[PDB]
Amino acid sequence: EELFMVGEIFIYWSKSHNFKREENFVVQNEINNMSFLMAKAGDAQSGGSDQTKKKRRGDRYSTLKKMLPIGLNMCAPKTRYALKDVREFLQNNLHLQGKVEGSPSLRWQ
């Protein structure tokens, strides 16, 4: 939390794995692997995109993450995210679009 940073990017690669977990029937086979025998923790990294002190200012916004929320609507539909457009924020927009599509997987729960 104090870093808000590359450590979050290291978590972001795990978030890409979360998209992979979101990606087939073999993912259910991991439960079949569990038959012989997660991603939510990584969500904190998405919060880092909103950033250090600017995050404290974020409650006053009601900070930058709200613009990322616009990407979340697009997430249901990912080079296309770039069309909505600080290029790093577009990368942060993509991981949020992925986490939002991962959030669509949370609807299954």
Partner: protein, 852 residues
């Protein structure tokens, strides 16, 4: 510090008196042991120790209560969204804690670790204001018995009595204070079925225990030390198959008839003090007790003597309890202490805005009303009642209100933000009422009149700045209000003016600033109370015509800027604000008329020298008006070029936006709004209508004119209904002024006579008629055209005069051939018909003289 302390979300509905946790209306966890409660205890991980910052979280929509421990999850999930939940904490015996809520500056490990990440809302993001938390007193206070009180179960019927006994075999200690005390012969009596401490109780009682007797007397010395032995013995009353009787007759000295028969006064006699006829009762299971020389019911109230026992609805029988919320009292005390000398210091003043109910004395702060909603509402109605009793003018009564309200208390009403809003609206309206109302009456119509003096100062007014209503050039008159500050030995209530306008202006800066910086406290608990009472106070005080120009400029900067108008608003607030803009339009119009009349007076001698350089002369002034088709005429043209016309347009530019986006529901808003709209466009025509009411006057006479003006402000105030004498006084004074001779034209420019006639209207539904008709007659006498203006109402005056008022008709008819012609024959039909009514006379000579 470490220790048990239930903490978590709960509901408003919860009873404070009950121990927290086990009840349905809570969702909380332990510190010690670390488990939790809803409907009973559940296991729950990690008890906290001292220095373990907590944090507690809820999702509504999805329903969860995730308590955090230094931001760590370890619950009360899937709760129904009911009341809207209170955050809550509750200490055990001697455990210590420190709740803190919101203020991101104060935000710490509790928040940064989890708060603005997952997406959640600490309380001061909601508010500029510090929260007002609540807590139980240990002290019992009676509250009237709810149906099913644990299961104690009151009932009533009326020989005076009432039935009792919990249907439940419930355990212990009812403390039944009766609702109504005493003040300083009367039978009382109590009947009990299946041991009990019958007697009488002081208002300050607060002991809830199985113990009895337990609560004192006093004996003065004479510092000789002699013996002024008498002093005190009252601090109360007590005692200790088949039923029994026990009265409590008093005024005065106490009595105690065990089994209906005397057993000595174990306690007796008192100065002049309240005593509830309370009884303490350990239940003896089913059917326990019953209740009831003039009756107590008589002594307690107005109907004393009115002897027979009239049992009453207030005769409630509350149990004293224990634990009730009583407001944190945000601002509190500023004590500081020392040792090795043990000095202690406080110094700083600050105050509760207290009240009490005398019948049950208690130091009940007004802020406490905010949860005490019923009694709150009742108080708001008391405020409306004072607003009604102040009664538009009627100043005499108002001083009695000054006895009951205090100026400073209203100033505190200006002070507090935590005060719940309806009451606030009531108090600021009291400030409008007790004081300012006479001012707005005095200067409303007089705002309409637009008269000006011919002082040389009026010669210097101009129009353009080298626009805006900021100038204090004012001129005109509008006679000063006379205050009558209220001594209490042995006719217009007053304020510290300059302070109150300062307090109020500051109040606006501190009002608009909060929403300009944006927040949602919202001050009164609603935006409507966050502005309307205040903007009322301001617009009204502004009507009063105080405010030095710089402060009005402060209002303008507060609005234009060149902003309150920047703000999105509630309908009502928009209404008041429209009244405010309306005052600006009236003020600017006063500026316009003022500049134009000022130019008239400036142009007078320039014309009159031209008149004589080598009525019908007024027609020559019309020749001056023939300038439309002599360089001075070019000066006149240039002045039209000035007269033709940001302010008016901003009113357009935004009021139209209101009427657009808002959908202006509720009339009157609309009416005043488009009244503004119409009056901004073509202010020239609004001026056109305005002019006849305006009338220039010679400065040397103005003083007397001023006096004459107040006479209107006498009668027009008296237009609204003893008082008839005040009126005769007023109209008499209107006779007394020489100006009424000197300037008849202003008099008729005033409604004046019709206003007097209006009184006649009210009078005609009786001795006032005399002053009225005398006035109207002489008013006919003073000039020719005025006789016409009075001529217009003859159908009314004639038809009314069945009986002197008719003499006015006569005077209206006397001189003019024109008026003589002017009447239609029907009016004569009315006269001759009344003469036909002279078949049964001497009014006939009167009507015939009218024909004469």
């Amino acid at each position: 510090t470490t220790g048990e302390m239930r903490v978590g979300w709960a509901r408003p509905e919860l009873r404070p008196d009950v121990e927290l946790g086990a009840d349905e209306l809570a969702y909380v966890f332990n510190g010690h042991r670390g488990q939790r409660w809803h409907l009973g205890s559940e296991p729950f991980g990690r008890p906290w120790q001292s220095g373990d910052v907590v944090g507690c979280m809820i999702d509504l929509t999805e329903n969860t209560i995730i308590f955090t421990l230094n931001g760590e999850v370890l619950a009360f999930r899937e709760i129904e969204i009911g009341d809207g939940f209170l955050p809550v904490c509750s200490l055990g015996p001697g455990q210590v804690g420190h709740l803190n809520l919101g203020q991101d500056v104060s935000s710490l490990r509790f928040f940064a670790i989890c708060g603005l990440q997952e997406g959640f809302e600490p309380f001061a993001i909601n508010m500029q204001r510090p929260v007002t938390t609540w807590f139980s007193k240990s002290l019992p206070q009676f509250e009237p018995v709810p149906p099913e009180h644990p299961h104690y179960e009151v009932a009533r019927m009326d020989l005076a009595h009432r039935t009792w006994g919990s249907q439940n075999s419930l355990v212990e200690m009812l403390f039944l204070r009766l609702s109504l005390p005493v003040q300083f012969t009367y039978y009382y009596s109590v009947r009990v079925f299946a041991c009990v401490w019958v007697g009488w109780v002081t208002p300050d009682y607060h002991q809830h225990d199985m113990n009895f007797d337990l609560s004192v007397t006093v004996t003065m010395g004479d510092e000789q030390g002699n013996v002024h032995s008498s002093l005190k013995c009252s601090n109360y009353m007590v005692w200790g198959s088949h039923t029994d009787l026990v009265i409590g007759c008093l005024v005065g000295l106490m009595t105690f008839t065990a089994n209906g028969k005397e057993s000595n006064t174990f306690f007796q006699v008192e100065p002049n003090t309240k005593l509830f006829p309370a009884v303490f009762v350990l239940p003896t299971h089913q059917n326990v007790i019953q209740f009831e020389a003039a009756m107590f019911l008589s002594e307690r109230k107005n109907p004393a003597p009115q002897c027979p026992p009239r049992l009453e609805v207030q005769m409630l029988m509350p149990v004293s309890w224990s634990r009730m919320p009583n407001h944190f009292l945000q601002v509190e005390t500023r004590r500081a202490g020392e040792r090795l000398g043990w000095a202690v210091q406080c110094q700083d003043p600050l105050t509760m805005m207290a009240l009490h109910i005398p019948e049950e004395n208690r130091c009940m702060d007004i802020l406490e009303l905010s949860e005490r909603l019923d009694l709150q509402r009742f108080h708001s109605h008391t405020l409306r009642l004072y607003r009604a009793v102040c009664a538009l003018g009627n100043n005499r009564v108002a001083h009695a209100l000054c006895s009951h309200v205090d100026q400073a208390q209203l100033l505190h009403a200006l002070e507090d933000a935590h005060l719940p809003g309806p009451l606030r609206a009531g108090y600021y309206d009291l400030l409008i009422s007790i004081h300012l109302e006479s001012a707005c009456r005095s200067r409303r119509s007089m705002l309409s009149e637009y008269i000006v003096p011919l002082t040389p100062e009026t010669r210097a007014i101009t129009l353009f700045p080298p626009g805006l209503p900021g100038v204090g050039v004012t001129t005109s008159l509008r006679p000063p209000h006379h205050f009558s500050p209220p001594c209490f030995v042995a006719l217009s209530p007053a304020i510290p003016l300059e302070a109150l306008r300062d307090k109020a202006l500051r109040m606006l800066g501190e009002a608009v600033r909060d929403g300009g910086q944006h927040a949602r406290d919202p001050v009164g608990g609603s935006v409507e109370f966050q502005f309307v009472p205040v903007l009322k106070l301001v617009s009204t005080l502004l009507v009063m015509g105080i405010f030095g120009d710089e402060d009005v400029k402060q209002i303008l900067k507060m609005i234009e800027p060149e902003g309150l108008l920047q703000m999105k608003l509630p309908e009502s607030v928009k209404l008041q604000m429209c009244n405010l803009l309306e005052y600006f339009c009236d003020q600017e119009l006063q500026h316009r008329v003022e500049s134009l009349a000022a130019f008239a007076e400036r142009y007078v001698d320039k014309l009159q020298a031209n008149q004589r350089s080598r009525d019908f002369h007024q027609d020559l002034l019309a020749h001056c008006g023939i300038q439309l088709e002599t360089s001075l005429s070019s000066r006149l043209r240039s002045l039209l070029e000035t007269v033709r016309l940001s302010l008016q347009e901003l009113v357009s530019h935004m009021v139209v936006r209101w009427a657009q986006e808002d959908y202006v529901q509720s009339p009157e808003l609309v009416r005043a709004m488009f009244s503004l709209l119409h009056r901004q466009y073509d202010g020239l025509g609004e001026l056109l209508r305005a002019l006849p009411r305006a009338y220039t006057i010679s400065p040397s006479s103005v003083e007397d004119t001023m006096s004459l003006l107040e006479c209107l402000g006498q009668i027009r105030s008296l237009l609204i209904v003893q008082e008839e004498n005040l009126m005769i006084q007023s109209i008499g004074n209107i006779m007394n002024n020489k100006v009424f001779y000197q300037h008849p034209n202003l008099m008729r420019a005033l409604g004046m006579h019709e206003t007097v006639m209006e009184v006649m209207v009210n009078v005609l539904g009786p001795k006032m008629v005399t002053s009225c008709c005398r006035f109207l007659c002489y008013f006919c006498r003073i000039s020719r055209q005025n006789q016409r203006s009075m001529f217009d109402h003859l159908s009314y005056l004639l038809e009314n005069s069945g009986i002197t008022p008719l003499d006015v008709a006569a005077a209206s008819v006397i001189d003019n051939n024109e008026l003589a012609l002017a009447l239609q024959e029907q009016d004569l039909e009315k006269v001759v018909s009344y003469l036909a009514g002279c078949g049964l006379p001497c009014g006939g000579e009167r009507y015939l003289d009218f024909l004469r």
